[PDB]
N, CA and C of each residue as an Amber inpcrd file, in Angstrom:
protein
   537
  14.4060000 -18.4260000 -11.3250000  13.8410000 -19.3070000 -10.2770000
  12.4440000 -18.8290000  -9.8730000  11.5650000 -19.7620000  -9.5220000
  10.2030000 -19.4120000  -9.1250000   9.6770000 -20.3670000  -8.0570000
   9.6820000 -21.6570000  -8.3680000   9.2000000 -22.6820000  -7.4390000
  10.2690000 -23.0650000  -6.4170000  10.8580000 -22.0670000  -5.7800000
  11.8820000 -22.2990000  -4.7710000  11.2410000 -22.6010000  -3.4170000
  11.7790000 -23.5850000  -2.7120000  11.2390000 -23.9680000  -1.4110000
  12.1790000 -23.5640000  -0.2770000  12.6920000 -22.3430000  -0.3420000
  13.5980000 -21.8700000   0.6890000  14.0790000 -20.4540000   0.4380000
  13.1700000 -19.5830000   0.0180000  13.5100000 -18.1880000  -0.2570000
  13.1760000 -17.2910000   0.9350000  13.5340000 -17.7410000   2.1330000
  13.2690000 -16.9860000   3.3560000  14.4700000 -17.0300000   4.3020000
  14.7300000 -15.9130000   4.9720000  15.8450000 -15.8090000   5.9080000
  15.3580000 -15.3970000   7.2960000  16.2250000 -15.5760000   8.2910000
  15.9160000 -15.2310000   9.6830000  15.4810000 -13.7750000   9.8230000
  14.6410000 -13.5190000  10.8250000  14.1370000 -12.1760000  11.0890000
  15.1960000 -11.2470000  11.6690000  16.3680000 -11.2610000  11.0620000
  17.4880000 -10.4360000  11.5010000  18.4560000 -10.1530000  10.3500000
  18.5860000 -11.1130000   9.4410000  19.4960000 -10.9890000   8.3020000
  18.9660000 -10.0290000   7.2250000  17.6450000  -9.9230000   7.1060000
  17.0380000  -9.0480000   6.0990000  17.2260000  -7.5640000   6.4280000
  17.0530000  -6.7320000   5.4110000  17.1880000  -5.2860000   5.5480000
  16.3490000  -4.5840000   4.4890000  15.9990000  -3.3300000   4.7520000
  15.1750000  -2.5340000   3.8360000  15.7620000  -2.4670000   2.4210000
  17.0820000  -2.5350000   2.3070000  17.7290000  -2.4870000   0.9950000
  17.5040000  -3.7980000   0.2460000  17.5700000  -4.9130000   0.9700000
  17.3210000  -6.2240000   0.3760000  15.8720000  -6.2600000  -0.0920000
  14.9910000  -5.6530000   0.7020000  13.5780000  -5.5680000   0.3650000
  13.3810000  -4.7540000  -0.9100000  14.1170000  -3.6450000  -1.0450000
  14.0270000  -2.8140000  -2.2490000  14.4530000  -3.6390000  -3.4560000
  15.4490000  -4.4790000  -3.2410000  15.9510000  -5.3650000  -4.2750000
  14.8860000  -6.4280000  -4.6060000  14.0950000  -6.7860000  -3.5940000
  13.0330000  -7.7770000  -3.7390000  11.9560000  -7.3300000  -4.7370000
  11.4330000  -6.1040000  -4.6080000  10.4120000  -5.6570000  -5.5560000
  11.0500000  -5.2220000  -6.8760000  12.3030000  -4.7840000  -6.8230000
  13.0000000  -4.3510000  -8.0310000  13.1590000  -5.5140000  -9.0120000
  13.5600000  -6.6750000  -8.4980000  13.7200000  -7.8720000  -9.3190000
  12.4120000  -8.6660000  -9.3550000  11.2960000  -7.9480000  -9.3310000
   9.9730000  -8.5660000  -9.3510000   9.1860000  -8.0630000 -10.5680000
   9.8390000  -8.0540000 -11.7260000   9.1920000  -7.5930000 -12.9440000
   9.1980000  -6.0760000 -13.0780000   9.3280000  -5.5950000 -14.3080000
   9.3460000  -4.1550000 -14.5830000   7.9360000  -3.5520000 -14.5620000
   7.1520000  -3.9480000 -13.5710000   5.7860000  -3.4560000 -13.4170000
   5.7460000  -2.0630000 -12.7920000   4.6970000  -1.3130000 -13.1260000
   4.5130000   0.0450000 -12.6210000   4.4250000   0.0630000 -11.0910000
   3.6270000  -0.8380000 -10.5320000   3.4690000  -0.9190000  -9.0830000
   4.1200000  -2.1870000  -8.5420000   4.6660000  -2.1000000  -7.3380000
   5.3190000  -3.2330000  -6.6970000   5.0200000  -3.2340000  -5.1930000
   4.4980000  -4.3530000  -4.6940000   4.1690000  -4.4850000  -3.2760000
   5.1630000  -5.4240000  -2.5940000   5.8460000  -4.9370000  -1.5650000
   6.8250000  -5.7510000  -0.8460000   6.6310000  -5.6220000   0.6630000
   6.5250000  -6.7530000   1.3370000   6.3180000  -6.7630000   2.7800000
   7.3510000  -7.6510000   3.4820000   7.7900000  -7.2180000   4.6610000
   8.7650000  -7.9640000   5.4410000   8.5980000  -7.6860000   6.9260000
   7.7020000  -8.4310000   7.5610000   7.4150000  -8.2460000   8.9820000
   8.3200000  -9.1100000   9.8540000   9.1360000  -8.4550000  10.6690000
  10.0410000  -9.1530000  11.5750000   9.2800000  -9.6340000  12.8000000
   8.7580000 -10.8410000  12.7080000   7.9810000 -11.4220000  13.7860000
   8.8680000 -12.0100000  14.8850000   8.9040000 -11.3220000  16.0280000
   9.6700000 -11.7700000  17.1900000   8.7280000 -11.8720000  18.3790000
   7.5310000 -12.3370000  18.0890000   6.4860000 -12.4790000  19.0860000
   6.7070000 -13.6820000  19.9960000   7.2610000 -14.7420000  19.4430000
   7.4840000 -15.9460000  20.2190000   6.2500000 -16.8280000  20.2330000
   5.5630000 -16.8720000  19.0960000   4.3540000 -17.6700000  18.9350000
   4.3790000 -18.3550000  17.5700000   3.8520000 -19.5690000  17.4810000
   3.8180000 -20.2850000  16.2090000   2.5290000 -19.9660000  15.4590000
   2.6680000 -19.5290000  14.2210000   1.5100000 -19.1570000  13.4170000
   1.2150000 -20.1820000  12.3280000  -0.0330000 -20.1960000  11.8880000
  -0.4890000 -21.0850000  10.8280000  -1.5740000 -20.3670000  10.0130000
  -1.3570000 -20.2270000   8.7070000  -2.3070000 -19.5300000   7.8340000
  -3.7020000 -20.1280000   7.9430000  -4.6510000 -19.2910000   8.3410000
  -6.0280000 -19.7160000   8.5150000  -6.8780000 -19.2810000   7.3160000
  -6.7320000 -18.0180000   6.9080000  -7.4860000 -17.4750000   5.7720000
  -6.8010000 -16.2330000   5.2040000  -6.7610000 -16.1330000   3.8830000
  -6.1450000 -14.9930000   3.2070000  -6.9440000 -14.6090000   1.9610000
  -7.3560000 -13.3490000   1.8750000  -8.1280000 -12.8760000   0.7230000
  -7.8740000 -11.3910000   0.4630000  -7.7980000 -11.0200000  -0.8060000
  -7.5600000  -9.6330000  -1.1840000  -8.8420000  -8.9550000  -1.6640000
  -8.9800000  -7.6910000  -1.3020000 -10.1350000  -6.8820000  -1.6640000
 -10.0470000  -6.4090000  -3.1200000  -8.8300000  -6.1760000  -3.6110000
  -8.6580000  -5.7080000  -4.9870000  -7.5580000  -6.4780000  -5.7210000
  -6.3080000  -6.2440000  -5.3410000  -5.1840000  -6.9110000  -5.9940000
  -5.0000000  -8.3600000  -5.5740000  -3.7610000  -8.8360000  -5.5700000
  -3.4910000 -10.2010000  -5.1760000  -1.9960000 -10.3760000  -4.9200000
  -1.5680000 -11.6180000  -4.8030000  -0.1720000 -11.9550000  -4.5540000
   0.0630000 -13.4060000  -4.9660000  -0.7660000 -14.2820000  -4.4170000
  -0.7190000 -15.7070000  -4.7020000  -1.9910000 -16.3730000  -4.1880000
  -2.3600000 -17.4980000  -4.7840000  -3.5620000 -18.2150000  -4.3760000
  -3.3400000 -18.9150000  -3.0260000  -2.1160000 -19.3760000  -2.7860000
  -1.7740000 -20.0470000  -1.5320000  -0.3900000 -19.6030000  -1.0420000
  -0.2670000 -19.3890000   0.2640000   0.9870000 -18.9320000   0.8670000
   1.3450000 -19.7710000   2.1070000   2.6140000 -19.7040000   2.5900000
   3.0790000 -20.4790000   3.7640000   2.1750000 -20.3380000   4.9970000
   2.0970000 -21.4020000   5.7900000   1.2620000 -21.4020000   6.9890000
   2.0730000 -21.6320000   8.2710000   3.1400000 -20.8510000   8.4530000
   3.9990000 -20.9490000   9.6430000   4.7850000 -19.6570000   9.8660000
   4.6750000 -19.0830000  11.0630000   5.4050000 -17.8610000  11.3970000
   6.0120000 -17.9920000  12.7960000   7.1370000 -18.7090000  12.9160000
   7.8120000 -18.9190000  14.1970000   8.5770000 -17.6730000  14.6560000
   9.0210000 -17.6870000  15.9040000   9.7670000 -16.5610000  16.4690000
  11.1280000 -16.3810000  15.7940000  11.4870000 -15.1300000  15.5380000
  12.7610000 -14.8200000  14.9190000  12.7580000 -15.0100000  13.4140000
  11.6480000 -14.6840000  12.7670000  11.5590000 -14.8210000  11.3150000
  10.7070000 -13.7180000  10.6940000  11.2090000 -13.1530000   9.6070000
  10.5090000 -12.0890000   8.9060000   9.5730000 -12.6660000   7.8490000
   8.3240000 -12.2300000   7.8770000   7.3310000 -12.6990000   6.9200000
   7.4230000 -11.8940000   5.6280000   7.8780000 -12.5510000   4.5680000
   8.0240000 -11.9150000   3.2620000   6.7180000 -11.9870000   2.4700000
   6.3800000 -10.9030000   1.7900000   5.1590000 -10.8490000   1.0010000
   5.3550000  -9.9240000  -0.2010000   4.6480000 -10.2020000  -1.2820000
   4.7540000  -9.4050000  -2.4990000   3.4590000  -9.5210000  -3.3070000
   3.0310000  -8.4300000  -3.9190000   1.8100000  -8.4500000  -4.7150000
   1.9180000  -7.5850000  -5.9660000   1.0460000  -7.8320000  -6.9520000
   1.0710000  -7.0910000  -8.2230000  -0.3420000  -6.8820000  -8.7760000
  -1.2630000  -6.4510000  -7.9030000  -2.6870000  -6.2000000  -8.2480000
  -3.3760000  -7.4020000  -8.9430000  -4.6740000  -7.2640000  -9.1960000
  -5.4860000  -8.3290000  -9.8160000  -5.1330000  -8.5640000 -11.2920000
  -5.0050000  -7.4680000 -12.0380000  -4.6570000  -7.4730000 -13.4750000
  -5.8100000  -7.9540000 -14.3580000  -6.4330000  -9.0580000 -13.9750000
  -7.5400000  -9.6150000 -14.7450000  -8.7300000  -8.6760000 -14.8960000
  -9.3800000  -8.2780000 -13.7830000 -10.5610000  -7.3940000 -13.8070000
 -10.2520000  -5.9280000 -14.1770000 -10.9430000  -4.9990000 -13.5230000
 -10.7820000  -3.5740000 -13.7900000  -9.4960000  -3.0160000 -13.1360000
  -9.3100000  -1.7050000 -13.2010000  -8.1320000  -1.0730000 -12.6160000
  -8.2840000  -0.9370000 -11.1030000  -7.4380000  -1.6500000 -10.3800000
  -7.4510000  -1.6410000  -8.9290000  -6.0660000  -1.9740000  -8.3990000
  -5.6380000  -1.2600000  -7.3720000  -4.3220000  -1.4860000  -6.8050000
  -4.2410000  -2.7670000  -5.9830000  -3.5860000  -2.7000000  -4.8400000
  -3.4630000  -3.8680000  -3.9810000  -4.0810000  -3.6180000  -2.6160000
  -5.1850000  -4.2870000  -2.3760000  -5.8890000  -4.1960000  -1.1140000
  -6.1880000  -5.6250000  -0.6720000  -5.9080000  -5.9730000   0.5760000
  -6.1490000  -7.3400000   1.0180000  -5.8980000  -7.5580000   2.4980000
  -6.3240000  -8.7230000   2.9870000  -6.1720000  -9.0980000   4.3970000
  -5.5750000 -10.5050000   4.5430000  -4.5460000 -10.6240000   5.3760000
  -3.9270000 -11.9160000   5.6510000  -4.2180000 -12.2870000   7.1040000
  -4.5490000 -13.5490000   7.3640000  -4.8840000 -13.9730000   8.7140000
  -4.2790000 -15.3400000   9.0500000  -3.5360000 -15.3680000  10.1420000
  -2.8800000 -16.5830000  10.6220000  -3.3450000 -16.9210000  12.0390000
  -3.4990000 -18.2110000  12.3230000  -3.8970000 -18.6610000  13.6530000
  -2.6610000 -18.5830000  14.5570000  -2.8540000 -18.1280000  15.7870000
  -1.7530000 -17.9400000  16.7240000  -1.5440000 -19.1640000  17.6170000
  -2.6150000 -19.8950000  17.8760000  -2.5380000 -21.0810000  18.7150000
  -3.8190000 -21.9050000  18.6020000  -4.7020000 -21.7710000  19.5820000
  -5.9570000 -22.5260000  19.6040000  -7.0950000 -21.8040000  18.8860000
  -7.0930000 -20.4730000  18.8960000  -8.1710000 -19.7600000  18.2340000
  -8.0220000 -18.2500000  18.2660000  -6.8650000 -17.7730000  17.8530000
  -6.5790000 -16.3450000  17.7810000  -5.9830000 -16.0830000  16.4130000
  -6.4030000 -15.0300000  15.7520000  -5.9170000 -14.7470000  14.4090000
  -5.4820000 -13.2920000  14.2550000  -4.2240000 -13.0710000  13.9140000
  -3.7370000 -11.7110000  13.7140000  -3.9350000 -11.3300000  12.2520000
  -4.8800000 -10.4390000  12.0090000  -5.1920000  -9.9960000  10.6600000
  -4.4560000  -8.7110000  10.3120000  -3.8470000  -8.7000000   9.1390000
  -3.1120000  -7.5380000   8.6660000  -3.7520000  -7.0170000   7.3780000
  -4.0080000  -5.7190000   7.3270000  -4.6250000  -5.1060000   6.1570000
  -3.5970000  -4.3600000   5.3060000  -3.8050000  -4.4110000   3.9960000
  -2.9570000  -3.7430000   3.0070000  -3.8700000  -3.0310000   2.0240000
  -3.4960000  -1.8310000   1.6120000  -4.3240000  -1.0720000   0.6910000
  -3.5020000  -0.0510000  -0.0940000  -3.6970000  -0.0230000  -1.4070000
  -2.9990000   0.9270000  -2.2720000  -3.7480000   1.1120000  -3.6000000
  -4.0790000   2.3700000  -3.9520000  -4.7950000   2.7070000  -5.1920000
  -3.9060000   2.5670000  -6.4390000  -4.5060000   2.1530000  -7.5500000
  -3.7790000   1.9740000  -8.8100000  -3.6570000   3.2980000  -9.5810000
  -3.4080000   4.3830000  -8.8610000  -3.2540000   5.7050000  -9.4710000
  -2.5830000   6.6490000  -8.4740000  -1.6530000   7.4580000  -8.9560000
  -0.9290000   8.3920000  -8.1010000  -1.6980000   9.7010000  -7.9460000
  -2.0390000  10.0300000  -6.7070000  -2.7690000  11.2480000  -6.4020000
  -2.5930000  11.5850000  -4.9150000  -3.6830000  11.8760000  -4.2240000
  -3.6350000  12.2180000  -2.8010000  -3.7150000  10.9630000  -1.9320000
  -4.4270000   9.9570000  -2.4280000  -4.6030000   8.6930000  -1.7080000
  -3.2540000   8.0320000  -1.4110000  -3.1730000   7.3170000  -0.2970000
  -1.9300000   6.6590000   0.0970000  -2.1730000   5.2200000   0.5610000
  -1.0970000   4.5360000   0.9440000  -1.1660000   3.1430000   1.4110000
  -1.8480000   3.0410000   2.7740000  -2.5140000   1.9170000   3.0390000
  -3.1760000   1.7160000   4.3180000  -2.8830000   0.3180000   4.8580000
  -2.4580000   0.2550000   6.1140000  -2.1370000  -1.0100000   6.7630000
  -2.6800000  -1.0300000   8.1940000  -3.2470000  -2.1550000   8.5970000
  -3.8080000  -2.2670000   9.9430000  -3.7030000  -3.6860000  10.4890000
  -2.9520000  -3.8270000  11.5750000  -2.7700000  -5.1110000  12.2490000
  -3.6580000  -5.1810000  13.4950000  -4.3630000  -6.2900000  13.6710000
  -5.2390000  -6.4580000  14.8320000  -5.5940000  -7.9330000  15.0460000
  -5.8470000  -8.2950000  16.3000000  -6.1890000  -9.6690000  16.6670000
  -7.6930000  -9.9530000  16.5080000  -8.0000000 -11.0550000  15.8400000
  -9.3710000 -11.5060000  15.6280000  -9.4850000 -12.9470000  16.1370000
 -10.4620000 -13.2330000  16.9820000 -10.6260000 -14.5910000  17.5220000
 -11.0020000 -15.5710000  16.4100000 -10.5050000 -16.7980000  16.5240000
 -10.7630000 -17.8290000  15.5300000 -12.2210000 -18.2660000  15.4400000
 -13.0430000 -17.4220000  14.8440000 -14.4620000 -17.6970000  14.6670000
 -14.9920000 -16.8200000  13.5370000 -15.6570000 -17.4450000  12.5620000
 -16.2110000 -16.7450000  11.3870000 -15.0880000 -16.2490000  10.4500000
 -15.2100000 -16.5680000   9.1680000 -14.2060000 -16.1830000   8.1750000
 -14.2390000 -14.6730000   7.9060000 -13.0810000 -14.0270000   8.0390000
 -12.9650000 -12.5860000   7.8020000 -12.9750000 -12.2900000   6.3100000
 -13.7000000 -11.2580000   5.9220000 -13.8020000 -10.8820000   4.5160000
 -14.2910000  -9.4270000   4.4010000 -14.8340000  -9.0550000   3.2470000
 -15.3380000  -7.7000000   3.0130000 -16.4220000  -7.3230000   4.0280000
 -17.3940000  -8.2140000   4.1980000 -18.5150000  -7.9800000   5.1110000
 -18.0830000  -7.8920000   6.5740000 -16.9150000  -8.4170000   6.9010000
 -16.4420000  -8.3680000   8.2760000 -15.9290000  -6.9750000   8.6410000
 -15.1900000  -6.3480000   7.7270000 -14.6320000  -5.0090000   7.9580000
 -15.6440000  -3.9040000   7.6210000 -16.4140000  -4.1060000   6.5520000
 -17.4010000  -3.1160000   6.1190000 -18.6160000  -3.0660000   7.0470000
 -19.5560000  -2.1790000   6.6820000 -20.8340000  -1.9220000   7.3860000
 -20.6820000  -1.5190000   8.8590000 -20.0300000  -2.3390000   9.6470000
 -19.8360000  -2.0470000  11.0590000 -18.5470000  -1.2550000  11.2740000
 -18.6610000  -0.1360000  11.9820000 -17.5130000   0.7240000  12.2750000
 -16.6570000   0.1600000  13.4180000 -16.4600000  -1.1510000  13.4280000
 -15.6700000  -1.7940000  14.4740000 -14.2550000  -2.1150000  13.9840000
 -14.1510000  -2.5990000  12.7560000 -12.8590000  -2.9640000  12.1790000
 -12.6500000  -2.3130000  10.8090000 -12.6970000  -0.9900000  10.7890000
 -12.4980000  -0.2170000   9.5690000 -11.6660000   1.0270000   9.8990000
 -10.3910000   0.8120000  10.2000000  -9.4910000   1.9080000  10.5510000
  -8.0310000   1.5690000  10.2220000  -7.6450000   1.6400000   8.9350000
  -6.2770000   1.3460000   8.4990000  -5.3310000   2.5440000   8.6730000
  -4.0680000   2.2680000   8.9820000  -3.0770000   3.3250000   9.1650000
  -2.4660000   3.7450000   7.8320000  -2.3170000   5.0470000   7.6440000
  -1.7540000   5.5940000   6.4160000  -0.2320000   5.4000000   6.3660000
   0.2370000   4.7380000   5.3160000   1.6610000   4.4980000   5.1460000
   2.4130000   5.7340000   4.6720000   3.6270000   5.9210000   5.1860000
   4.4710000   7.0580000   4.8210000   5.9340000   6.7610000   5.1620000
   6.8370000   7.2080000   4.3000000   8.2890000   6.9910000   4.4620000
   8.7840000   7.3120000   5.8870000   8.8170000   6.3040000   6.7560000
   9.2790000   6.5090000   8.1210000   9.1640000   5.2530000   8.9610000
   8.9810000   5.4270000  10.2680000   8.8450000   4.3050000  11.1960000
   8.3350000   4.7730000  12.5580000   7.4560000   3.9900000  13.1630000
   6.9100000   4.3410000  14.4720000   6.4750000   3.0960000  15.2490000
   6.6160000   3.1420000  16.5650000   6.2490000   2.0110000  17.4180000
   4.8510000   2.1930000  18.0220000   4.1330000   1.0860000  18.1530000
   2.7860000   1.0730000  18.7450000   2.3090000  -0.3680000  18.9490000
   1.5700000  -0.6210000  20.0290000   1.0820000  -1.9780000  20.3110000
   0.0330000  -2.4180000  19.2890000   0.1090000  -3.6740000  18.8660000
  -0.8180000  -4.1940000  17.8680000  -2.2230000  -4.4180000  18.4390000
  -2.2980000  -4.7540000  19.7180000  -3.5890000  -4.9890000  20.3430000
  -3.5260000  -6.0560000  21.4170000  -2.9420000  -7.1980000  21.0750000
  -2.8140000  -8.3100000  22.0120000  -1.9110000  -7.9240000  23.1900000
  -0.7990000  -7.2680000  22.8900000   0.1200000  -6.8550000  23.9340000
   1.4230000  -6.3230000  23.3730000   1.9660000  -7.0230000  22.3860000
   3.2270000  -6.6330000  21.7560000   3.0990000  -5.3040000  20.9990000
   4.2380000  -4.7190000  20.6500000   4.2710000  -3.4620000  19.9140000
   5.0280000  -3.6320000  18.6050000   4.5400000  -2.9900000  17.5650000
   5.1820000  -3.0660000  16.2700000   6.0720000  -1.8450000  16.0300000
   7.3570000  -2.0950000  15.8210000   8.3220000  -1.0310000  15.5730000
   8.6620000  -0.9830000  14.0890000   7.9740000  -0.1210000  13.3590000
   8.2080000   0.0020000  11.9330000   7.2050000   0.9070000  11.2720000
   7.0370000   0.7570000   9.9730000   6.0810000   1.5670000   9.2400000
   6.0070000   1.1050000   7.7890000   5.2530000   1.8350000   6.9920000
   5.0690000   1.5120000   5.5850000   5.5920000   2.6320000   4.7020000
   6.4630000   2.2960000   3.7840000   7.0360000   3.2780000   2.8750000
   6.1530000   3.4330000   1.6390000   5.7300000   4.6690000   1.3810000
   4.8760000   4.9910000   0.2440000   5.7030000   5.1570000  -1.0400000
   5.6230000   6.3310000  -1.6740000   6.3720000   6.6320000  -2.9140000
   6.1360000   5.5930000  -4.0230000   4.8640000   5.3520000  -4.3280000
   4.4920000   4.4020000  -5.3650000   4.7010000   2.9580000  -4.9490000
   5.9450000   2.5080000  -4.9910000   6.2930000   1.1430000  -4.5940000
   6.2980000   1.0830000  -3.0710000   5.4690000   0.2230000  -2.5050000
   5.3420000   0.1530000  -1.0570000   6.0710000  -1.0170000  -0.4210000
   6.6760000  -0.7260000   0.7230000   7.3860000  -1.7260000   1.5120000
   7.0090000  -1.5800000   2.9910000   6.6220000  -2.6790000   3.6200000
   6.2310000  -2.6530000   5.0310000   7.3290000  -3.2690000   5.8890000
   7.9840000  -2.4360000   6.6810000   9.0500000  -2.8900000   7.5590000
   8.6430000  -2.6620000   9.0110000   7.7580000  -3.5140000   9.5110000
   7.2880000  -3.4100000  10.8870000   7.8240000  -4.5750000  11.7140000
   8.5370000  -4.2660000  12.7820000   9.1070000  -5.3130000  13.6320000
   8.2760000  -5.4690000  14.9120000   7.5510000  -6.5770000  15.0450000
   6.7260000  -6.8090000  16.2370000   7.5510000  -7.4020000  17.3740000
   7.5290000  -6.7200000  18.5060000   8.2630000  -7.1540000  19.6900000
   7.4490000  -6.8370000  20.9430000   7.8780000  -7.3140000  22.1050000
   7.1460000  -7.0590000  23.3490000   7.0180000  -5.5560000  23.6380000
   5.8720000  -5.1560000  24.1900000   5.6150000  -3.7520000  24.5070000
   6.5950000  -3.2360000  25.5640000
């Protein structure tokens, strides 16, 4: 199956093991990117802009993130160009003009470097891209992923209870809830 129009479950039924199964049954590729954000913010989201710095996932993705639903995501680098892991930013509109941007980053080689993820609110004005995060030291601070979990406010007000699992294949299990 591939063109399925219902491969998503409530932000409660999923589990880290199901997620492991998600990237496992995602091709016998060396690297596997799996994301599952339990969004319990209580706000309706709509995909505004999505672009990857190195790897990829899909050209177009769902544009709705209601309360009580986990956002599933998966990537497998660019493949076409040079050797590069999975780095990218996803941005959804929260209402009239607020966009929660999430960063993902992972090198296509095992060494000292690790995964990087950063969630933050960006007002609905000007398309976010490389030039938005680069040059200016305002939005260039991603969190290093590591096998564990920790709570912290995203910025707007709510707090994310989760973390990013490294060990080659990365999985993001962050549950956003009220602070």
